[PDB]
Amino acid sequence: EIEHLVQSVCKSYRETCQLRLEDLLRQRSNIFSREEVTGYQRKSMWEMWERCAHHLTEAIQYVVEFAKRLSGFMELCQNDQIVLLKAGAMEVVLVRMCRAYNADNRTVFFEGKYGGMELFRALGCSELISSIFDFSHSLSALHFSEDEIALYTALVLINAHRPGLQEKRKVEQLQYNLELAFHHHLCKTHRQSILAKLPPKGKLRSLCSQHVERLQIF
């Protein structure tokens, strides 16, 4: 039952989405004041990193939970579960971020209110911050439904081309079933148009790099 897989993926996302879409939307009117932005800008680069590291670690935890709830993920050997999540959990976090991005005014939900990219000045990777904002802006243009996000992010994670897989065929089978589910659903809703608009697999990989690794120090 591939319809069972669909329903399961969608439930797992609903249970682990971290922030409810209705709360994210309702809070769009809530914008960081100039004094609050200045307050963030005054923080040490080190403090901004530890705050961001904390929030990212928390977000990853929920992505791992999501994976553990996917029918068949738990059937994979432990080595492969680790390989897939090590490679893909942060990629899913970056995709999930688009829900918390408001294209109207180019702001992102951060610690309870919406702010623009200048809020993150203290991080000192303004090229990186700009790329994250641009990526989120690109995804927001797709107007993902919750279920499309569920199925798309499951496929970000369940990718049989990750180096180091011990049971590649098992992962291929799971990935293919999930692709069938996704493509079938998009076809029944006339949403085929989004596939061509998704970021190339290389874009997500490129963004998910040297900056977000070795955060143990934080």
Ligand X SMILES: Cn1ccc2c(S(=O)(=O)N(CC(F)(F)F)c3ccc4c(c3)CCCN4C(=O)c3cccs3)cccc21
Instruction: Report the interface residues with ligand X, using CB under 6 A.
Output: 52, 55-56, 59, 90, 93-94, 97, 108, 110, 120, 128, 132, 207-208, 211-212
Q: Which of 176, 125, 184 is nearest to 155 (CA)?
A: 176
Q: What does the alpha-carbon distance between residue 214 and residue 199 come to, in Å, rounded to a whole number?
A: 26
Of 186 and 215, nearer to ligand X (C-beta) is 215
User: How is residue 200 annotated by DSSP?
Assistant: P
User: Using CA atoms, how far apart are residues 218 and 215, in angstroms rounded to an integer?
Assistant: 5
Backbone angles phi, psi at 54, to 5 degrees: -60, -50
Cβ proximity to ligand X, 132 vs 174, nearer residue: 132
CB of 66 to ligand X, least distance (A): 13
Give the shortest CB-9-to-ligand X separation in angstroms. 20
Comparison of 37 and 212: residue with beta carbon closer to ligand X:
212
- Residue reference for tokens 């960081």: 32
Output the residue with the shortest Cβ distance to ligand X: 59
The first and second tokens of residue 2, run together, are: 């591939």
Nearer of residues 99 and 185 to ligand X, judged by Cβ: 99
